[PDB]
Structure formats: C-alpha cells, structure tokens
Amino acid sequence: AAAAAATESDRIAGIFNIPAGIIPTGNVLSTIEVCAHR
Amino acid sequence: QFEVQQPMIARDGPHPVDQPVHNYMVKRIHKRSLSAAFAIASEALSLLS
C-alpha cells in the first residue's frame, strides 16, 4: 500500500539535502563486510 | 562487520521522544587447523629410484 505518501516521503528526502531520486520501497540486500588485517 | 538497525514505535504521552539506535558489532576471525599421520617405508623410496 502507501502508508505515508511515497511522493511526500521522496519530497521530504529531497528537501533535506539528500538528492535521492528514488527512495527504495521494498526489499534491500546489501553486502556484508569482511575485513582482513595482514 | 555487521550493521544492525532496531525498529522503534512512534509514541506519545508524558515521555520524551526516543532516538532510533544503530548497533555495529564486529567479531574477530578465529583460526584453527588439523593434520593427520601418513608414513611411507624406505623400500618404497628405493623402488622409486
């Protein structure tokens, strides 16, 4: 559905210095970080 | 490196607003090894010559 307006959410994102063209509305899969010290 | 976010609830009443919380957990990698025994007789070397 919509909950708070998606257009309004994207506008609020834009006005507060974030130039996010598309705010994700769904499943997001990021990459786990593996840090090695040699 | 894991970054974990925690959901919260918008609330009201005689309580000040609470801040959403990040948590950045790190675990160090634990290293181990295993080995096994394997012997070869001398005469085998003699025949490989």
Swiss-Prot record, chain A:
Family: Belongs to the herpesviridae major capsid protein family.
Coiled-coil regions listed in the entry: none
Annotated protein name in UniProt: Major capsid protein
Compartments, as annotated in UniProt: Virion; Host nucleus
Organism: Varicella-zoster virus (strain Dumas) (HHV-3)
Known role: Self-assembles to form an icosahedral capsid with a T=16 symmetry, about 200 nm in diameter, and consisting of 150 hexons and 12 pentons (total of 162 capsomers). Hexons form the edges and faces of the capsid and are each composed of six MCP molecules. In contrast, one penton is found at each of the 12 vertices. Eleven of the pentons are MCP pentamers, while the last vertex is occupied by the portal complex.
Complex and partners: Homomultimer. Makes the hexons and eleven out of twelve pentons. Interacts with triplex proteins 1/TRX1 and 2/TRX2; adjacent capsomers are linked together in groups of three by triplexes, heterotrimeric complexes composed of one molecule of TRX1 and two molecules of TRX2. Interacts with scaffold protein; this interaction allows efficient MCP transport to the host nucleus. Interacts with capsid vertex component 2/CVC2. Interacts with the small capsomere-interacting protein/SCP.
